[PDB]
Design a protein around this ligand. Structure first.
Ligand SMILES: *[B]([O])([O])[C]([C][C]([C])[C])[N]C(=O)[C]([C]C1=[C][C]=[C][C]=[C]1)[N]C(=O)C1=[C]N=[C][C]=N1
Ligand SMILES: *[B]([O])([O])[C]([C][C]([C])[C])[N]C(=O)[C]([C]C1=[C][C]=[C][C]=[C]1)[N]C(=O)C1=[C]N=[C][C]=N1
Ligand SMILES: *[B]([O])([O])[C]([C][C]([C])[C])[N]C(=O)[C]([C]C1=[C][C]=[C][C]=[C]1)[N]C(=O)C1=[C]N=[C][C]=N1
Ligand SMILES: *[B]([O])([O])[C]([C][C]([C])[C])[N]C(=O)[C]([C]C1=[C][C]=[C][C]=[C]1)[N]C(=O)C1=[C]N=[C][C]=N1
Ligand SMILES: *[B]([O])([O])[C]([C][C]([C])[C])[N]C(=O)[C]([C]C1=[C][C]=[C][C]=[C]1)[N]C(=O)C1=[C]N=[C][C]=N1
Ligand SMILES: *[B]([O])([O])[C]([C][C]([C])[C])[N]C(=O)[C]([C]C1=[C][C]=[C][C]=[C]1)[N]C(=O)C1=[C]N=[C][C]=N1
Ligand SMILES: *[B]([O])([O])[C]([C][C]([C])[C])[N]C(=O)[C]([C]C1=[C][C]=[C][C]=[C]1)[N]C(=O)C1=[C]N=[C][C]=N1
Ligand SMILES: *[B]([O])([O])[C]([C][C]([C])[C])[N]C(=O)[C]([C]C1=[C][C]=[C][C]=[C]1)[N]C(=O)C1=[C]N=[C][C]=N1
Ligand SMILES: *[B]([O])([O])[C]([C][C]([C])[C])[N]C(=O)[C]([C]C1=[C][C]=[C][C]=[C]1)[N]C(=O)C1=[C]N=[C][C]=N1
Lengths: 195, 183, 184, 189, 195, 184, 189, 183, 192
């Protein structure tokens, strides 16, 4: 990772966009990356609980527990976080996208969203498998409910849709409720009348 | 490795209607045990077959194959545990012809619930979780039938590893005699 | 370690008795050797029955169909007996024994599901290999429907994920004809 | 890759340390216990009366290293509020439960899991006997620590921890592991 | 490979069916398996140049040079060789199937045939690559011609068809000319009138 | 070994001059860092041009589109310059610079072709992933047609296999606007 | 897995040896040279006047081992007919070309390929110089052996073998490597 | 590894308009050489850039990148081979500003045709075979332009490895002076 | 490596004092960084001496010659000092310091021998590289003869196998000029 630098002020490129209240979620999600995203949110909200945070998303997903950490921290924090999917937002990364501030969830034109039920693995004795099987079942229902809340769709629809991989174009993601605008071009700064 | 007689040593004891189950149990060894039974019963459906057991267990499906074939075959099979009979190998021991299930003095029996592993999606895990649950209850029931113990007891005993001396295996019902000399 | 008997190894001796074992996962090499035993046993006597004991988790559809097609083609009727496990293609081979001569032991299982596989290549190449897997899926659903008697719309929905059957459940599904406990 | 902030350039975790925030987000081994312990000691030396927030996302780890973190929280004057985000399991559950009473928090979809210790020993029979006894004490010791800090009868924690025992955040409230399920930032009541 | 045995006569199962003039081509084709197939043909033709040889085929293909060895030996040998594809006959194995004695090329119902152009690889200098590139080009045209001969199809059709993987059902293989009969059931021995 | 200059490393200093390098194969991590540099350079001045030097063999379509979509979205016009090699997604990024501001050096190349990939799973799962690759294929053919001016039926037949273009050939195909030899 | 035939059970290659057939179907290293040489010596001891058929499918190998096979064919009284099925390259081409004149045969789609030797040397400068000289002799030696047995001028084989030179069976006829392209079994003319 | 001055040693010689090409050439090193040229020419398009060469060669595409950038940039680049300049690195040497291409006495130049590798189907190999053929002719032409030799000669010389002493490189046209002391 | 504070690592600080270390085996990347330090030190001041401490087992001839050619080319005189070991190309670099300013410590060694290498390829390709190694052999024998004063057939017969020299033996052979044991005392001088 040969990330570039910018300028008595030396940042790397992601650290400089952090000073502009931009966070990148660009890797698969495991505990380590959840923690560092959570920590950036906590810091940006402490800096100013009223300004918006932009969270750019390019991720294939990851661990439900780490994803929920990011989710719960977005809801908890006072600052509203606008999610923007560039390229790919799948599995837990779709959920994080859908859970931005309503009205400020954006996709670029050729970005995608994909959703599906969780997957995992257990080894152990029958008693041990039974316990973990029950745990994965709760996560499944829990994540279906979180999706239904934030898209507006009836829950038996998300359950049916996520049974296998469900790929959405950005427009299809609009029509599904996962985002609010498909953004193509950056508009001009605008003037206003003071009557 | 194995010595010869004028057969190899296990093949010669097969002409004396002796079968060895001395390895861990996977499909390949189940098949070859099943096949020896089928052959020995075709040779003579009334004579006894001795099945010497030294095994730590194995796959439930392969073990049941051996079990189902012992019950199905007309010849009565006497099970003898020398050294170790654990997990599915305990079940096979317990399912010899009642009255001719034998242990040597320092042999052991160990029983416990099944273990396994599943990868896949939530739907896929749910299915295999269900399957392991049936095998658990099924094997507890098979044990209760052949020892005489109440089923609530085998379920609580097999929750973790349950080691039995040969005498303790007598009192539990897994065998019929602790054999020391050759009468 | 397979044992010997005075003339054979144990599987070769039960072959004299017209017994064939399908006890491994199915790949081309084991299909060929099963096919070859059938061809030989039918040449030796096209009217006597062949017993095919099944303990297998399945395998490649192409190799499995080889075994299937050879059972239908050969004049001798082949009784399938599942001991322990018959899954995926091995379930199909079980179901395709001579009607009335398909047997399970009490604690044996059957499992059925749709095929799985993998393709690496360009988009054109994947499209071709995707179409091929789709035909195999429909083809195997149809073969199952014919030999169990079930409506095809049912096998397709049942095989969407792993579908485990006890031997009794296999009897009511049509995959076998008798759950055999004793020697009768 | 951790980002930086600004005659002062910190990395993001080091900056939240100036705000008396510590992260326990990895599995617990001696190396991470030591660095958590050291941050506590420093934060208490800077001001023994202000609170320390300890964010927890960890699957657990070695009992000895975990106890190090535990013992240091009790010993230090400053009260440490534990907050589980995502996951707190095994020793990490214990550390969660041992925050200042009333200041132990979970986010809504976070989890707690508890169970007895696991380990391994090679050696001769004499050697195995010794470390078998050691694991037995740790089991009894950790059950007691849990009972103290949740309020549950000890016969209950021993039965509950016999296998993996997963708790939702609400279930963790009811069990006594935490004090509030916090959904929004206003914890200024 | 735990192949079984049969009976002062001890054979393994493939060696016994060889005494019945049956040869198996069941593995991918490399020089080693070409040689052993070639050798069985030479022996069976020396035993009796007029009786038929049955060649059962279940193979995904292999090296063109080794395949041609099998092909050239079938044509050269006086005995007619009936090819039977059970399961799969692809690439060079399709060619070997198609080159059985016309009228005695058989498929089982669910067997397949697949054909396509050759593939390979070369490392070396530009001069060296040019040489091997020319070699692969001849093999391509050569194998297209061999297919056209033995199916009856116009050559620009086989060239077009083999550009990518071309899968054929057994019926489709009949209609293409690669085989002569789709064989399902073994018929009874039959009686004949002596008028 | 990247060298430093008195305040930066060499790529970070040319970033001050609104130069971005896309010199590796394209995966999500390099897409993100290119996207981020664009966003920063456009925030610094939405009217000045950004030069994007390209030496890349291509990469993942999703990451490439990220770079593409960000170039179109950002107000500043981005001049693409291929030095050495621009293939697969890197060709697309080249072709999508500001019309009239797409340049090749004399011996640079462009190569285009359809996507490739791989899927492992059940038949249902493969069908889904096969449909996805098919959309990407058509989508990328359309993006190429828009930015070169060629009829779509032509890009589809040209990209069926590897299609190598010299810089001049790239000029007559529409992928670039000038073959630049000197400094002018 | 090679099959068997029958108070006599041979494997298939051993049975065709009783018919004075030898297979050279692998790459050539010392081990396979020795076993080919040994079969020749045995077949010539059984009957020095009958022909030996040597079927060739090989990509070549070590010059020293190949020459062993070559020298043994010339030395032995019995005439050895070489038949290339599939492939005969490098040393295997040389062995093909050195069958009894008039009894060197190719099947229609078989190939011949010829080229100069390749190898490798590590060591000091003195050591490299020595084995460089050795490879140079082998090059010149093998070019001469080819010229003898094809009839071509030596300046031509040297230029032709500078890189890989692939020949169809017909092209091999025209070049002198073989005597007949045999399509059908009747070679009884 | 590399020492520091109060910059690291290569970065300090960059402020003296010196660039090192000391590794084998792949896309990553082409890019960083190209970038240094672009920067040095932006600093001052009239001053010379010295490019010290010790490299065994590399990928043609990356090499051409370096070549095309030297021609394109206004500043004249003097190439100096110390030790070794082979394959693409020879081409880059030969393409310095005519008259300021230098070798040290015991440095070498080696030239030859490209090498590579292709996997794939026959159609795919045909395409990449064609590509390597163009690169071969293209690089022979670039050599002929910058040495002055007839093209038939570079094609026959580069058929295998062609090693040149620095003097032999002078007479061939690849350089302009064999430099021994620092005048 | 330790640090000293302007801040430097220990080798970078001794570079300030016009000291260069050649302490690893010689491959292209270490040749380049040695060459670059020379070029910089000579640009700093073409008249002051550069000390080059040598502890190396040798390396690639091409990279070594790079270091050699750069020492001759550069105006500043470079004193070579072998501490511990100077073998193969590293011996050559030692011998090619400014005559009279080539030094060994008492228990240091010099070893010389002919080049070694390896080639894989076709006969034509091997012939070409074989010729190349032969030139390097003679070229390096000549460079040694030039800088020691020995007759060339002597270096050729001596370098046929490994030829180890003590520092004294290296003096008598011509590879160095002084065996230095104690840093010469700092003294007070008469100014009449
Ligand atoms: B996803 O594909 O990103 C998905 C999220 C959910 C919204 C459908 N993730 C999972 O299902 C993960 C997969 C995984 C990734 C890496 C390591 C291990 C597992 N599964 C879990 O997080 C999980 C949950 N409960 C139990 C076990 N595993
Ligand atoms: B034992 O330990 O041998 C035991 C049998 C006992 C319950 C009567 N065996 C199992 O539990 C096996 C263990 C195993 C062996 C080899 C590979 C994998 C697992 N389990 C199963 O066979 C099984 C059954 N149903 C589902 C999954 N696994
Ligand atoms: B089963 O799991 O045994 C199943 C058969 C079922 C549908 C009747 N087999 C397959 O799905 C096999 C699995 C496999 C085995 C070995 C290598 C790869 C895959 N799949 C195929 O045979 C197959 C066929 N065509 C395309 C891809 N895969
Ligand atoms: B948990 O899974 O995080 C758990 C904590 C306890 C409260 C149940 N950890 C342990 O039990 C650890 C696991 C371990 C981690 C890494 C290496 C080895 C073991 N066990 C121990 O710390 C331990 C204690 N006594 C003896 C041996 N091991
Ligand atoms: B096939 O897929 O079986 C095919 C045969 C032809 C009828 C289309 N085989 C090949 O293309 C082989 C592939 C191969 C397999 C194993 C190792 C190496 C290559 N290619 C060749 O035989 C070949 C031909 N000429 C040059 C290089 N390789
Ligand atoms: B190219 O070769 O760079 C090409 C883009 C072209 C069509 C404009 N890229 C792909 O085809 C990539 C290659 C790849 C890179 C890394 C891992 C796997 C594959 N394919 C995909 O991005 C892709 C997308 N959807 C499904 C499968 N593969
Ligand atoms: B050919 O490629 O089969 C060829 C034969 C010759 C007529 C051109 N073989 C060789 O050149 C062999 C190749 C080799 C094979 C295995 C290990 C090492 C080399 N070379 C030699 O036999 C050889 C001869 N002299 C010196 C070194 N190597
Ligand atoms: B040389 O050896 O450095 C040489 C350049 C010379 C002809 C001016 N390089 C090549 O021939 C490279 C070799 C290579 C290096 C690294 C990986 C793979 C190959 N060849 C190519 O760059 C190339 C060009 N077109 C097609 C294939 N390969
Ligand atoms: B020595 O051991 O340092 C010696 C130098 C010379 C004074 C006798 N080195 C060599 O001979 C090197 C050895 C080597 C080192 C690292 C990789 C490969 C080889 N040989 C060459 O430099 C050489 C090899 N082939 C051709 C030209 N030069």
């Amino acid at each position: 990772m040969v990330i570039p630098y910018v300028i008595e002020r030396v940042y790397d490129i992601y650290s400089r966009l952090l000073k502009d209240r931009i966070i990148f979620l660009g890797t698969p999600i495991d505990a380590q990356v959840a923690n560092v995203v959570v920590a950036q949110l906590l810091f940006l909200d402490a800096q100013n609980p009223n300004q918006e945070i932009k969270l750019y998303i390019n991720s294939p997903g990851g661990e439900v527990d780490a994803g929920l950490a990011i989710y719960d921290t977005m809801q908890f924090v006072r600052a509203p976080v606008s999610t923007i999917v560039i390229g790919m937002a799948a599995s837990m990364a779709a959920v994080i996208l859908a859970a931005g501030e309503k009205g400020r969830r954006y996709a670029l034109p050729h970005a995608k969203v994909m959703i599906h039920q969780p997957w995992g693995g257990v080894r152990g004795t029958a008693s041990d498998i039974a316990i973990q099987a029950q745990e994965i079942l709760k996560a499944k229902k829990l994540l279906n409910e979180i999706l239904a809340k934030h898209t507006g769709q009836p829950l038996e629809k998300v359950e049916k849709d996520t049974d296998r991989d469900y790929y959405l174009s950005a427009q299809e993601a609009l029509e599904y409720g996962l985002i609010d605008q498909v953004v193509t071009r950056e508009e001009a700064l605008e003037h206003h009348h003071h009557h």
